Structures are given as C-alpha cells and as structure tokens.
Amino acid sequence: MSHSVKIYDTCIGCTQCVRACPLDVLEMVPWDGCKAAQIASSPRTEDCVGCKRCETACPTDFLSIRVYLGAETTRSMGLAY
Amino acid sequence: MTISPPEREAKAKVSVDNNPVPTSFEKWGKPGHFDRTLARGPKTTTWIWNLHANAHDFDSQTSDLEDVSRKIFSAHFGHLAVVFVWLSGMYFHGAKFSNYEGWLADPTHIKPSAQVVWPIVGQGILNGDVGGGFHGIQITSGLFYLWRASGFTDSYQLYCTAIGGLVMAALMLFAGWFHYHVKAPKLEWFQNVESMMNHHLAGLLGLGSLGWAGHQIHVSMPINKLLDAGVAPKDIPLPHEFILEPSKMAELYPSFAQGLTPFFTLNWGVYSDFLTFKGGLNPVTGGLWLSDTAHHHLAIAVLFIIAGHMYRTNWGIGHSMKEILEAHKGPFTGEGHKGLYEILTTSWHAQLAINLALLGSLTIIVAQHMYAMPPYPYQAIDYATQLSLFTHHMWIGGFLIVGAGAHGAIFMVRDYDPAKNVNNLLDRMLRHRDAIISHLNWVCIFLGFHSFGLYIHNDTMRALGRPQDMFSDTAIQLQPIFAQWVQHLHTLAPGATAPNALATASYAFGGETIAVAGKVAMMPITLGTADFMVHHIHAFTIHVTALILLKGVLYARSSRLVPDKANLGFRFPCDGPGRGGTCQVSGWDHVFLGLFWMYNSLSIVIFHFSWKMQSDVWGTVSPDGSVTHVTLGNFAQSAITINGWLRDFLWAQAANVINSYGSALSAYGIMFLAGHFVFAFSLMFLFSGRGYWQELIESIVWAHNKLNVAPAIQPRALSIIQGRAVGVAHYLLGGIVTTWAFFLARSLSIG
Amino acid sequence: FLISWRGYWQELIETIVWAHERTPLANLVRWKDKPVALSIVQARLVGLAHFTVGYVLTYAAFLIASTAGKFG
Amino acid sequence: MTELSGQPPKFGGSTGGLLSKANREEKYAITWTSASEQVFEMPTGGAAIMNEGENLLYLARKEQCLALGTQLRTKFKPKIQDYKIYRVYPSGEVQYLHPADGVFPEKVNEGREAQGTKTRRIGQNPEPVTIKFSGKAPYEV
Amino acid sequence: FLVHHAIALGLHTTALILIKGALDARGSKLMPDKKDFGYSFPCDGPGRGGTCDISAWDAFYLAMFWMLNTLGW
Amino acid sequence: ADDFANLTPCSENPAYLAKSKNFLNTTNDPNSGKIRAERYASALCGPEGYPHLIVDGRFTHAGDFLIPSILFLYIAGWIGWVGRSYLIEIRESKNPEMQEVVINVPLAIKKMLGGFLWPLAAVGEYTSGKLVMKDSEIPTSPR
Amino acid sequence: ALNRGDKVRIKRTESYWYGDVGTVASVEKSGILYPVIVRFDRVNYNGFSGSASGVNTNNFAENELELV
Amino acid sequence: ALYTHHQYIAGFLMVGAFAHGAIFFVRDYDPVANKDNVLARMLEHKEALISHLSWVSLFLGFHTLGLYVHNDV
Numbered sequence A: 001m002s003h004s005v006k007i008y009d010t011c012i013g014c015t016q017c018v019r020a021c022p023l024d025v026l027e028m029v030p031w032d033g034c035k036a037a038q039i040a041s042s043p044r045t046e047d048c049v050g051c052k053r054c055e056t057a058c059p060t061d062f063l064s065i066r067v068y069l070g071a072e073t074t075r076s077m078g079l080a081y
Numbered sequence B: 001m002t003i004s005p006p007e008r009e010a011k012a013k014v015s016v017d018n019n020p021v022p023t024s025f026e027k028w029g030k031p032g033h034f035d036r037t038l039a040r041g042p043k044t045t046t047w048i049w050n051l052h053a054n055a056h057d058f059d060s061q062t063s064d065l066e067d068v069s070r071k072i073f074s075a076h077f078g079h080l081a082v083v084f085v086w087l088s089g090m091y092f093h094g095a096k097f098s099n100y101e102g103w104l105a106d107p108t109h110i111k112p113s114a115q116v117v118w119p120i121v122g123q124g125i126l127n128g129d130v131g132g133g134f135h136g137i138q139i140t141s142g143l144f145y146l147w148r149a150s151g152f153t154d155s156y157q158l159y160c161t162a163i164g165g166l167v168m169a170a171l172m173l174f175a176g177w178f179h180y181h182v183k184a185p186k187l188e189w190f191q192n193v194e195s196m197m198n199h200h201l202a203g204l205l206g207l208g209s210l211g212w213a214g215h216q217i218h219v220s221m222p223i224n225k226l227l228d229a230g231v232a233p234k235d236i237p238l239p240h241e242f243i244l245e246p247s248k249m250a251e252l253y254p255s256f257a258q259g260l261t262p263f264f265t266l267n268w269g270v271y272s273d274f275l276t277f278k279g280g281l282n283p284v285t286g287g288l289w290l291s292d293t294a295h296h297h298l299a300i301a302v303l304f305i306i307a308g309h310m311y312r313t314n315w316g317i318g319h320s321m322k323e324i325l326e327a328h329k330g331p332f333t334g335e336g337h338k339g340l341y342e343i344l345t346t347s348w349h350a351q352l353a354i355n356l357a358l359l360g361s362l363t364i365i366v367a368q369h370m371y372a373m374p375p376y377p378y379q380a381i382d383y384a385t386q387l388s389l390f391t392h393h394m395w396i397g398g399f400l401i402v403g404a405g406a407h408g409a410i411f412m413v414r415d416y417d418p419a420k421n422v423n424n425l426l427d428r429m430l431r432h433r434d435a436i437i438s439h440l441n442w443v444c445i446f447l448g449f450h451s452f453g454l455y456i457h458n459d460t461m462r463a464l465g466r467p468q469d470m471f472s473d474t475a476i477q478l479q480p481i482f483a484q485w486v487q488h489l490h491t492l493a494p495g496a497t498a499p500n501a502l503a504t505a506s507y508a509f510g511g512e513t514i515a516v517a518g519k520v521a522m523m524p525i526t527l528g529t530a531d532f533m534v535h536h537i538h539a540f541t542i543h544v545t546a547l548i549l550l551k552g553v554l555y556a557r558s559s560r561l562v563p564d565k566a567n568l569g570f571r572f573p574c575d576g577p578g579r580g581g582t583c584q585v586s587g588w589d590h591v592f593l594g595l596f597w598m599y600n601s602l603s604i605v606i607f608h609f610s611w612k613m614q615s616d617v618w619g620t621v622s623p624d625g626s627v628t629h630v631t632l633g634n635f636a637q638s639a640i641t642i643n644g645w646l647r648d649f650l651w652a653q654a655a656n657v658i659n660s661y662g663s664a665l666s667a668y669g670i671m672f673l674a675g676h677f678v679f680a681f682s683l684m685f686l687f688s689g690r691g692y693w694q695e696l697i698e699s700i701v702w703a704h705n706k707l708n709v710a711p712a713i714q715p716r717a718l719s720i721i722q723g724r725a726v727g728v729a730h731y732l733l734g735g736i737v738t739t740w741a742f743f744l745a746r747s748l749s750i751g
Numbered sequence C: 001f002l003i004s005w006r007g008y009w010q011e012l013i014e015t016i017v018w019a020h021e022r023t024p025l026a027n028l029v030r031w032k033d034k035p036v037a038l039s040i041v042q043a044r045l046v047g048l049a050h051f052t053v054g055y056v057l058t059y060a061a062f063l064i065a066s067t068a069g070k071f072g
Numbered sequence D: 001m002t003e004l005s006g007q008p009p010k011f012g013g014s015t016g017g018l019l020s021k022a023n024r025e026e027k028y029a030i031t032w033t034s035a036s037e038q039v040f041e042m043p044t045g046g047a048a049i050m051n052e053g054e055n056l057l058y059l060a061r062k063e064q065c066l067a068l069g070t071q072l073r074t075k076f077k078p079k080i081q082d083y084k085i086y087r088v089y090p091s092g093e094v095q096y097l098h099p100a101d102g103v104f105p106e107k108v109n110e111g112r113e114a115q116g117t118k119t120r121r122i123g124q125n126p127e128p129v130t131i132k133f134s135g136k137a138p139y140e141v
Numbered sequence E: 001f002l003v004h005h006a007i008a009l010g011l012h013t014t015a016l017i018l019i020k021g022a023l024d025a026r027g028s029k030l031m032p033d034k035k036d037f038g039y040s041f042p043c044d045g046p047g048r049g050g051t052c053d054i055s056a057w058d059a060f061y062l063a064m065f066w067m068l069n070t071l072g073w
Numbered sequence F: 001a002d003d004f005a006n007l008t009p010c011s012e013n014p015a016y017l018a019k020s021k022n023f024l025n026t027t028n029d030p031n032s033g034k035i036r037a038e039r040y041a042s043a044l045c046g047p048e049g050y051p052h053l054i055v056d057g058r059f060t061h062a063g064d065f066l067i068p069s070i071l072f073l074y075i076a077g078w079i080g081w082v083g084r085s086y087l088i089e090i091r092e093s094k095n096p097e098m099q100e101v102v103i104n105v106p107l108a109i110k111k112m113l114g115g116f117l118w119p120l121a122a123v124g125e126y127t128s129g130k131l132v133m134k135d136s137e138i139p140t141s142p143r
Numbered sequence G: 001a002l003n004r005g006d007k008v009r010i011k012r013t014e015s016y017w018y019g020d021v022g023t024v025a026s027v028e029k030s031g032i033l034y035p036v037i038v039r040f041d042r043v044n045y046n047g048f049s050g051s052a053s054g055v056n057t058n059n060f061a062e063n064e065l066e067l068v
Numbered sequence H: 001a002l003y004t005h006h007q008y009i010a011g012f013l014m015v016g017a018f019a020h021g022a023i024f025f026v027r028d029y030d031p032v033a034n035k036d037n038v039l040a041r042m043l044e045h046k047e048a049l050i051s052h053l054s055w056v057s058l059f060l061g062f063h064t065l066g067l068y069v070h071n072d073v
C-alpha cells in the first residue's frame, strides 16, 4: 500500500525534509549532484502518512521531494486503533 | 525622562520601573514593528493581514511576562477610555438629540427617540413621528428608562454626564500612557492575587453598590416617588435640594426625621420608609421598586465589603489562596489543586478563559433576570426594548463563552508545563479526556434525538393527519413537571417561606397579571409540552457547543492522530492530507466551529423568547380585564412542529420587515436583505479553498504583468485559517443582522 | 460537511472508538472495518450532494404547491 | 532484536494508551537512558516520570514514539539522544526501526542505499497519455 | 433586463470556474505537476501557502454551486 | 413616428402625475418633489408611472447613459492611470513595497494632479512600449 | 558564460519564475548539476500557510537561463 | 415543472461537459500531436481567457447588484 515519496535531482542536500518528517521515512545518503554531497531518500515509505511536512520544508524552486498519496493502510491513515 | 512624580509607594507592595519605555512617534511610521517577521518588509499581501492578526498577541511579541503584563494593563486603560467615550456619547445624544424631557412628561403616549437623521437622498423618512411633534429614530437601548430610574429630569444633567465621561476617558488614557511608559509596575505587583481580590470585592463591587445605594436613596427614590405621583418633572426640586432641605426628605420618608441614629444604634426597622422588601412591581410604572433596589444594593455593599477580607496581604490575618488550593485533594483526584495557584498567577490566558466564561454566563444571567424582573420604569411596556436588551446580552454572553474556550486552548498550547502539573486536576483530566469527550458526544446525540427528533415526529404525525399521535398538551403530554413545581413554590413564598416579602420575586412564576397602561407589564408564564421541547433543544445545543470547545481545549496538546499538535501551535490550518486528512485539528478551529454552534443555540434561544413572550405574555388588557395577546396564544399548538416555527413564527412575523418600505422602519428591511446577503457571501469562504483562489490570482496577475501594472507586494490568496475566520465572521454578522432587523421591525410594529 | 473539515471528526471518531472498545457487553462486538472520518474529497462530494438534493426538493415543493394551490 | 529491557515510566494510567490493536495487530516500543528521575509529557496526554537508568515504553504508533523521541532529544537539560524505537508484533517478534543504521537520518552516513531517487527534474516527468492503459503514474516510471 | 443580466453573470461565473479548472488542471504555479496527481485529489498540503481545493475536481465542485444559483435565478 | 409605443412621456401619464403630486422631499428643500415632478416629466415613463431610461444609443436620450458613461470613463481612466504611473515610478526606488504600504505623498499627489491628460498619455505609451509588455517577457504557468 | 550580476530569464517550465528575470549571484564549481545561483525580486510561494513571504533564490543549469 | 426540470437537467449536463473537458486535459491530452493547433493554442493563452472571464464576471456582478441595490434603497 503506502504513499510514494520521490526525490528528484534538484536536491541540494539541505536535509530539512528529514528533520521535518515525523515518522522517519527519509534519510540522507551520499551523492555528487549537489554541493552538500547528499541526497534525500525514502527507504521507509510504508510508514509514511502523507502529512507533507517534507514538502513544506523543501527550499528548491518547486519541491525536490514529492509525496503522492496512494493506497491507504492503517499505518498511512495514522490510526492508533 | 518624561514627567517624573515624587514616589507614591506608600510603603506598600508597590514596585515600579521608573521609565522603561520612552515615548516616541517613530514606531507609528513603521507598521509591523511589534513582530520580528513583519519588521523586515511586506513581500506579499499576507504581511498585511498578519499585521492585524498578531496586533494584540503580546505573548508572540515578547517573552518577558512583565512586559506583557504592563502592555495588558495599559491596554485595559485604553479600553476603558474607549468605553467611556462611548457612554459619554450616549449621554450627549440623550442630552442634545433626544426627546427625553418630552418623554418624561408623558411616557405612555410617546416613544423614546434619539439620533436625528439628516434629511438627504430621501433618508429623512427615517425620522418617524415618536410623539409630541418629535421626529427621529426610536431607540430600544432603554436609555430613557435607566435615566428616569437614576433621577434625570433635564438635558443639562445628561450633558454634564457626557462631559464627565469624556474627562474620565482622558483620565483612563493618560493613566495607560503613564503606567506603560513612565511608572510601570513590576511583575511582582500583578501577582498579588489576594490583594487584588480583596480590593475588587471590597472597593470595586462593595463601595460601588454602597455609593449607588446612597444616590438611589438621596436622588433616585425621591424624584421617582414624585414622578410616580404625577408632580411633573418641572415642579420636582433638583436632587441637591433634598440634601439641603432634610425636611423635604422627611416629608417623603418620615424615617429621615430620626437621622442616622437607627443606623449607628442598629434600630434599622424605622428605616422601613425607604429600605423595603415588597417583591413585586410598581403598579404605576411596571418596573422594580426603587426602594427594594436601594435596600438590595445596600445589602450587596455589605456582603461584598465583608467578603473583601478573606485574603491575606501584609498583616497576617486572611487566607493564602495557595494554601486553600493545596488543601483540597481527595481519593479520586490525587493531588487536587496542587499547582493551580502557580498557573493562575503566571498565565494570562488562564485567567482570561476563566473570566470570559464567568462573564458570559453572568451576561446571560443578566438578560434572563432583567426580562422577568424589569428593573427600570416603563421597560416592560416597550416590548422592543425588552426583546432587544435580552437578545443583546444573550449574544454578548455567548461570544464571551466562545472566547473562554479559545483562551483555554491557548493556555494549553502556550503556558502548560507538565512538570508543574503532576497528578493533579489538569493532569488527570488530560489522562481521561477520551472518557470525558466520548460521554459528552453520547449525551449530545441523545439530546439531538430526544429534542429535535420530537419536533420531526410531530411534523410527520400532523402531516399524516394524526394529531392524537403528536407530542403536545392535548395528546402525548410532556409536562415540565419540575419547573411547574418550582413556579408554584415561588408563588407561595411571600408570607410563607419568604415572610417579610410582600409579593413574589417575579410575576413570571405566577400570581396576578400586572398591567401598566393598555399593555401588560408582566404576568405568569405557563410551561407546557412545547416549553419542555424548546428547553431540551436549548440543553442539546449548549451541550454541543460545550462538546466542541472542551474537545478543543483537551486535545490542543495532542491526539491519537496528531501526537505532537502542541508544537504546531494554537492556530494552524492542519497537518496535511495524510492520515486521511487532518483539517481543523487546532484549538483555533474548534473555536471556529463553536462559533457557528453558539450562533445556532442563541438564535434558538432568542426565537423562543420572542415567540413565547408574544404568545403567552405580551398583549392588551381590557377595562374588563380580558387579555388579548400579541399573537393570540398560538405557541402551544404551533411551536411543537418545525413547520409551525417556519409559518406562524418566521413567515407570519416577517410581514412587518418586508412591508417596511416607504415607512420609518424601511432601514430595517434594508438591513434584513443586507444580513441575508452577507450570510450568503460567507459561504464562498467557508465552502471553498485557498488553492483555487491563488490559481485565479495567477491569471489576474498575468493580466497585470501584461500592462505592467503588477504590484510589488504580490497578491496572495487568503490563508486557510484566514479563509475560515472571514467565513465565520461574515456568517455570524449576516445572520445576526438579519435577526436584528427582524426583531426590531416586528417588535416596533406591534405597539 | 462543507463548513467543518475532516480532522476534527477523525479525533471525535477516535474518542467514539475508545468508548466502544471499553464498554462491556458492547465489547463482545467489533467492527469489521475500522471506522474513520470521511475523506476530504468525500466530504466535499457528500456536502454538495446534500446541498443539491435540498436545493432541488425545496424549490420543487414550493413551485408545485404554489402553482397548484393558486391554479396559475 | 532479541529481548527488550528497561523500567516502565512512573505513571498512574491514561485513556490515551494502547487499544485492542496493540494485542491484535502491532505495537511500538521506545527505550532510552535517563540521567535522573524527570517529568516528561506523555504523547497520549498527561505527565509521566522517567527513571534514572533504562526506560522502556510501549506506544500505539510509530509517530507517537518518534514524537516522544524528539521531545527527549530537544527538551531535556542533558539531552537524551539514546532512544531506540522498535516495532513489536503479537507473535513476540521484535523489529528494530529507529535509528536505522545507528545514526540519525538527518546526517549522512556511508552504506546507505538511495531509494525513491529520480534522475530528472519534476518538469521532466512523462505525459500521462504516453503511459495510459498501463498501471503507472508519471512519477512511477 | 435586470434578471437577464443576473443570468449573464451566473452563466459567466459558472463558465469562469469550469474553464479555469479545465485550463489549470494540467498545472499552474502552485502545482506545476498537477497532471501527475490526477483529476481528483484532496490537496497538496498546507505548504506553499496552502492548497485547499486545488484539483480540477474541486473546480467542478465549486462550479456546481454557481450552476444551482444560476438556475435558481 | 410610433417607436416605443409601450411607453408614453411622463407628462402624459396619469399615474405619474398622481404619484408626482405626492413626491417626497429629498433634502431640506420643500420643493425638491416639485423639482422632480418637473424634471422627470421629459423622459419616458410607463403604466406604473416610473421613468424608463433608453440606453439604445439614440441621441434624444443621450443624457440617459451616454453622458454618464463619458464622465465615469474619464474619472476611472484618471484613477487607474495615476495609480499605475505611481506604481511604475515607485518600482525603481530600491524598496517599492514599503512605499506601496506607506504612501509617498509628494509623488502620489504629483501623479494625481497630472491625470487630466490620461488619454493622451495612454495613447503615447501605446505608440511606444510602456503600455503593453511582450508575452515572452511575462511569467506564465505550465501548459 | 554566466557571471555575477547577470540578468537571466528563467526557462524551467515548473519554475515559479518561468518568464521572469533574476540576477546571477554565483556560479558554483564544476561537477554540480545546477550551479547557477539566481536571486529574484519576487518571492515564490514557499512557506507554511500564513507565512509572511517566501524564497527568493534557486539553483539552475546554464541552459535553463537566457541572457538578458 | 417541465420547464424547471429541463433547465436543471441542462445545468447538470453543462457542468458535466466542462468537468469531462478537464478530465480530458488531465488524462488524455497529448501536447506533441495537438502541438500548435487550436486545442493547444487555447492553453497557450489560458491566462488571457481566465482573466477576461474574471473581468466580465466582475463587470456584471458589480453593476447588476448596484442597480438592484439602488432600486431597493
């Protein structure tokens, strides 16, 4: 199920999305496309709820991290019951 | 270094800073200075709206609790200045633009009027003939009645009151300036809650009613006794002539012959000439007895002055509020009130929530008390004045209550410390808020089904031609048995459980039908199945408003959906479309929904009041005594169905507002249409969303770019929270203005 | 549905879910589908559906009844 | 993963805690070492007391554990950056979740494989008509 | 005359909503990739200023009110 | 010869006369109703006696919509032109936004005064390039 | 070929400033995908709802700019 | 009843027509094959269309409401 979280090559490696994410969906991995030498990654999208905090945080001209809401699970619906 | 007085510490708990904030006009020319985010510069039009949204948010402006307290103190001064200007304008318009003396000479055959419209573009039709050749707008504030009760006779006295009100406003304004800029009290000064409370109970409330009892005994009561006997206002001596001639006071009240000796020697009984306890209403004017009110204010002065001693300040005797709080803790509540004294002395929003709740409740109490115990002369004759004051105090109370919920939520977000609240009342309520809110939800559903559901059942039964299956006094009766029993107990109180009371506290509980002039002042108000149903509707709507607002407060920190909501703030749109969508989780949004539901509740309350008073109370009495009510006692059979409320209440009584054109009440029909318009207008903001409007602004901005007229402050659609604020503000304004026009036109047209 | 948006209802439904899971006798029964608040788009659509049904039925009853009682 | 240790925080109980899901579906655990007995905000409402030494707490959701973790690492005098978050299944199986490779994700780390990476801008996604009657959206290709 | 201009206002505003929705359904500046999100979706979150009722489906939903208003008139 | 046969001049309508002999005073002048009964008599009324206006374009009713149209369009052109020139001038003052919220009263009054020649300045900016900007030099959204 | 203070028009279709012009602030060293840092007078939409302003800087590749 | 019936049906049909035009643009529109034709040229100047629809709606609304309110007062 889960949502989809894509990271595009306009990433500047500021990591603000990872710090904003309240469910630990994102990581920083080494890259060579930007000065910061790091790119955001979404290795745990099965826990992603889709609150869009990462997108709120992204500074690049139109987001370099994009959350497309998809199939809804109890983890993705933020359910505690 | 402005004007520096000596000291004035009086060896007290006073502690001020001599001159913390200097006076200057430069920050006037820099709009947005109080917020760091706005002092930079407006790049989008959002900056503009924010400039108004955070003006009084002193917490987000500075972190010094002392500076916030000083700001609040000086703003209180400025607010009292505004209210003094308003009241002085009221007295000035009564002095130089009202028919108060002509009304005083013949109150029955004239209508209270102030404010003369200037004859232009045809608006001169609004100067309707109120009596004695006077043409103007009829006022429903009831200022003339308060003035006759006070003992006013000449316009020059009202003009002196207006001049004094302007001077008092200047005093409050200067005091605010002086106490924020020059001598600014330290934080330690505001935290003397025992001192403040002793003073407010003793000096503010007690001495106030003491001085007003003095004025009523010396000025109000004798002038009103001479007016009720018909001595005419031109022949009654000035108020001071009773102080200069104690024989004139003894001739009206022989008790004044014995002097102050009955007071000092506890011989109070001889004071029966002006300190009375009759209970009912004045036969000549329909208001309360001014001697009863003087004795009342006297006893209230006594009680409040005495109460102003419980708390401890500098002299050892008294009470420590922290001690009384910490003492109260039981087996169900862990540590009870341990920590409440600390939050009620360092958090402004806590005091504000408590005070807003109690003040709104008190204003509702004031409406419900002033309608049935009319305290002013000739008030009950004027059904417009009565209805207007009732609905006004209702709305004020409801708004204050919604604000109370708001600031409870704000406290929870901003000033809540879990270390200072461990296993106390607040902690345990947060620990079982799920239980609380789920049960309140169930009670709300039970009330909706068992109040409005009764109306739906009755509509369906009557439509099917099955009146015997309806809920009504003539079928399946739902008698308000307990309220009827309490009414009966009230009726039997004088002479029995109230020996020294001559009459009942309020004739709405039962008894004779007190009637002044051709109209009925007050008579018993029977209660039946329709009253049962309306009262349980009231219960339902009040419980739903409480559910919304209490849920807003209890979950402002967190929920199972949003566990870190406290970090998001009191006021924020959402936390994303994720988790299924999290729109309106903030405390602010709960206030936003509670606004609509309080509007719903109070609309029903005032509709109930208007219809019940027009059906079973107000009317014309005959020389034989026959009572023909305004709408012929139609409440019992019509107010039990929704179609009855739509036809016999709304549709029927709307006939005056719609036919008001070409007459003095035409502005009421105009404002009727205007309120409908603004209500409809609000639905655009409430039903839509910011994204569409911003995208449309994109094309409009492109058209501006095409002709090079694009503004540097980029147009941005209203923020989500602002969209809702605009929506709710216009919804409330439109609906309330509609019913304001409806009520005023209907009540002024029925004579 | 149009005015009041979704998160407030999801929190209320969570209180109701807790109320059910802790009420004995009712605890014998459990939902096959987890109760949740209506989605955002679903809310818009359901609110519009009520708006339109009420719109059409109100005006139809008015038109028909007025023209029939008056007979043109 | 193995067994989890730690003392439950001093707490009298709330209505906001675990429900039937915890036993029927899944649960989450957060462990942390504290320097003293200190009060902290319970993500399910109320104030609790963490103990000196090890503390294990069971919560209903991963986001609740992560909110508690941010509170631990941001609101305490000596900051607590020691908390570990696990997913607990009713079979007794425990799954280590956070922080993944022993290092917080905000900072880069070697041995991490990029996922969700797209070697183009947003504006370089294909047109939906070019992919209709597949099952994919322009971000999935 | 007056009701015919009310009718013209209603037709034009309903057409404006529907046409703005259709022409911005592929993308705008708030959502330059909106075609990747389909005709109907909840929103784009509270970021970038806030994006309530961003989809073209929302434009349909808003236009329905104006159609009903026009037909009322 | 027989145009607008469903209307008759207000001086010939009996309903208009019966209503105008009771016209209400508009200001403090007690002859404003008579002034109305005099002035409105020249236009076309109808069965109800209320004057009807003809925006058809014929000059016999040039005062019904043509003259007011000219007046309004002049005033609105003045307003928009002076506001636009104020905006353009301010744009190159290093901080245009602050001067948009805090008005530059000297420049503002100066631009307002020079607004009586706004159609001439409009034509002059059209013939140059100050009025209309080129599309490829304007921001647009994706298609 | 782009130097500091060059006025360049934006050619990125999804860019907020497509069709708008910005000044070049710096050109980062080679090896980077989008080196040209551009500052704009007009802020974009960046920010949480209710925020005062937004971002006025972004990185681009040279072929995504047009020299003015 | 028949007039009201058919007019309401017409309103629903019109709204649905524009809604499915939007759905076309979202799901089926091809820019390369429709390149430079009238269909694509409608998107090319979409800001002009939307802005002039806004202007005609504002024109009509302002002035029809103004005449109505003048007559009412």
Ligand code: CLA
Pocket: B021, B022, B023, B024, B025, B026, B027, B028, B034, B070, B071, B072, B074, B075, B077, B078, B079, B081, B082, B085, B169, B173, B174, B175, B176, B177, B180
């Ligand atoms: C010549 C008089 C004067 C001068 C120049 C100043 C100067 C200043 N005051 Mg001060 N003050 C004054 C009178 C004055 N005050 C009075 C009479 C009061 C009592 C209410 C106060 C109480 C006070 C407080 C509590 C605070 C200030 C603050 C400030 C500074 C912020 C600038 C500002 O106010 O923004 C511009 C303000 C305006 C343009 C005012 C517009 C009108 C407002 C919006 C509502 C008017 C209500 C009115 C005051 C009530 C009575 C009116 C009634 C009679 C009709 C500033 C340097 C603030 C500060 O410290 O800055 C951080 C602050 O917190 N003053």
Ligand code: CLA
Pocket: B072, B073, B076, B077, B080, B189, B190, B192, B193, B195, B196, B199, B200, B202, B203, B204
């Ligand atoms: C008996 C002493 C006394 C009295 C009369 C008051 C009265 C008042 N206080 Mg105060 N207070 C006191 C002691 C007193 N306080 C002490 C000791 C403290 C320290 C703990 C405080 C700290 C405190 C705070 C923090 C605040 C108040 C505020 C207020 C006002 C709010 C109530 C109101 O609006 O009602 C109606 C208002 C009026 C009727 C105004 C007329 C009263 C005038 C201004 C004073 C009376 C004149 C003087 C006594 C002489 C006249 C009487 C004499 C001729 C017989 C009010 C006028 C609030 C405020 O600032 O309001 C602006 C506020 O924020 N008080």
Ligand code: CLA
Pocket: B069, B190, B191, B192, B193, B194, B196, B197, B200, B201, B321, B341, B344, B345, B346, B347, B348, B351, B354, B355, B356, B358, B359
């Ligand atoms: C269920 C308990 C309860 C209830 C029913 C109330 C209800 C009420 N309180 Mg109270 N309060 C409580 C608990 C409660 N309080 C406790 C435990 C404390 C001890 C901390 C206080 C101390 C407190 C004070 C000091 C005052 C009140 C006042 C009031 C009345 C305000 C009416 C109003 O707003 O009109 C208009 C408002 C006024 C006429 C006066 C306003 C006084 C200021 C503006 C508010 C208090 C300022 C605050 C103490 C500042 C310090 C807090 C922090 C910054 C350190 C109201 C009926 C006020 C009052 O007048 O009492 C009669 C007031 O003076 N409360």
Ligand code: CLA
Pocket: B052, B053, B054, B055, B056, B057, B058, B352, B356, B399, B400, B401, B402, B403, B404, B406, B410, B570, B571, B588, B591, B592, B729, B733
């Ligand atoms: C003693 C009462 C009291 C006190 C002092 C406060 C104090 C405060 N409130 Mg509160 N509140 C109150 C009553 C009170 N409120 C009531 C009665 C309600 C219910 C409506 C609320 C609900 C509430 C909310 C929802 C919020 C606050 C907020 C705030 C803070 C910001 C002030 C502000 O709004 O900025 C400046 C004030 C304005 C911009 C008001 C102008 C807009 C008004 C509503 C238009 C009304 C129009 C008019 C009445 C009628 C129409 C006429 C028109 C055509 C001219 C501030 C510390 C805000 C906050 O952030 O808290 C920290 C906020 O979110 N309050």
Ligand code: CLA
Pocket: B441, B442, B444, B445, B446, B447, B448, B449, B452, B453, B456, B544, B547, B548, B593, B596, B597, C001, C003, C004
């Ligand atoms: C007429 C309009 C309307 C109606 C009927 C409702 C209905 C309801 N609202 Mg609501 N609301 C409205 C307008 C309305 N709202 C608007 C405009 C807003 C925006 C401000 C809100 C926002 C709002 C909030 C924030 C909340 C509510 C709440 C509630 C519920 C209260 C509980 C209750 O009354 O028990 C049930 C009553 C009913 C269901 C009414 C209908 C009952 C009929 C008479 C019986 C029907 C018989 C049978 C079932 C028919 C079946 C047909 C068959 C073919 C199957 C209730 C279901 C509160 C709540 O949830 O309380 C628990 C709450 O929190 N409303």
Ligand code: CLA
Pocket: B677, B680, B681, B682, B683, B684, B685, B687, B688, B692, B696, E013, E016, E017, E062, E063, E065, E066, H053, H054, H055, H057, H058, H059, H060, H061, H062, H063, H065
């Ligand atoms: C009676 C309710 C109402 C009103 C007045 C409006 C008004 C408007 N809508 Mg709207 N709408 C409504 C309900 C309403 N809507 C509802 C319920 C929905 C569904 C949610 C929508 C959804 C909607 C959409 C999606 C769109 C509109 C559009 C428009 C604008 C069309 C242009 C026009 O009418 O000409 C001119 C405008 C008017 C006549 C209205 C302004 C009237 C005021 C009184 C003029 C005078 C200004 C006033 C004096 C300001 C001073 C305030 C001060 C006194 C406090 C217009 C401003 C379209 C648009 O934006 O047009 C470009 C558009 O896209 N509406």
Ligand SMILES: CCCCCCCCCCCCCCCC(=O)OC[C@H](COP(=O)(O)OC[C@@H](O)CO)OC(=O)CCCCCCCCCCCCCCC
Pocket: B328, B329, B330, B331, B332, B333, B334, B336, B337, B425
């Ligand atoms: C007609 C009235 C119908 C209500 C009668 C049944 C009461 C319902 C709840 C029973 C317990 C509450 C009464 C004891 C009051 C009481 O305080 O009991 C005692 C106990 C706490 O008392 P303590 O021993 O802690 O006292 C020390 C205090 O200082 C605590 O700070 O309360 C509780 O156990 C918590 C539950 C109370 C919350 C229950 C309220 C539920 C809302 C119901 C509303 C009914 C409407 C009433 C009309 C006005």
Ligand SMILES: CC1=C(/C=C/C(C)=C/C=C/C(C)=C/C=C/C=C(C)/C=C/C=C(C)/C=C/C2=C(C)CCCC2(C)C)C(C)(C)CCC1
Pocket: E022, H014, H017, H018, H020, H021, H022, H024, H025
């Ligand atoms: C007058 C007259 C006449 C004439 C007529 C005419 C000529 C007309 C026409 C008319 C017309 C001409 C009309 C129209 C209408 C239109 C419309 C109604 C539209 C539309 C569209 C839509 C709705 C949609 C679209 C779309 C989109 C959105 C995108 C994609 C594509 C499509 C298409 C899908 C005659 C001589 C004969 C006779 C006498 C009279």
Ligand code: SF4
Pocket: A005, A020, A021, A022, A023, A024, A025, A026, A047, A048, A049, A050, A051, A052, A053, A054, A055, A067, B578
């Ligand atoms: S949408 Fe929310 S949960 Fe998903 S990756 Fe972004 S911040 Fe994390």
Ligand code: SF4
Pocket: A007, A010, A011, A012, A013, A014, A015, A016, A017, A018, A039, A040, A054, A057, A058, A059, A060, A063, A064, A065
């Ligand atoms: S916020 Fe955006 S630019 Fe920054 S690291 Fe995350 S994806 Fe990259």
Ligand code: SF4
Pocket: B573, B574, B575, B576, B577, B581, B582, B583, B584, B689, B720, C005, C040, E042, E043, E044, E045, E046, E050, E051, E052, E053
């Ligand atoms: S629709 Fe608006 S309020 Fe709702 S989640 Fe989306 S952005 Fe937030």
Ligand SMILES: [Cl-]
Pocket: B462, B638, B641, B643, B644
């Ligand atoms: Cl009925």
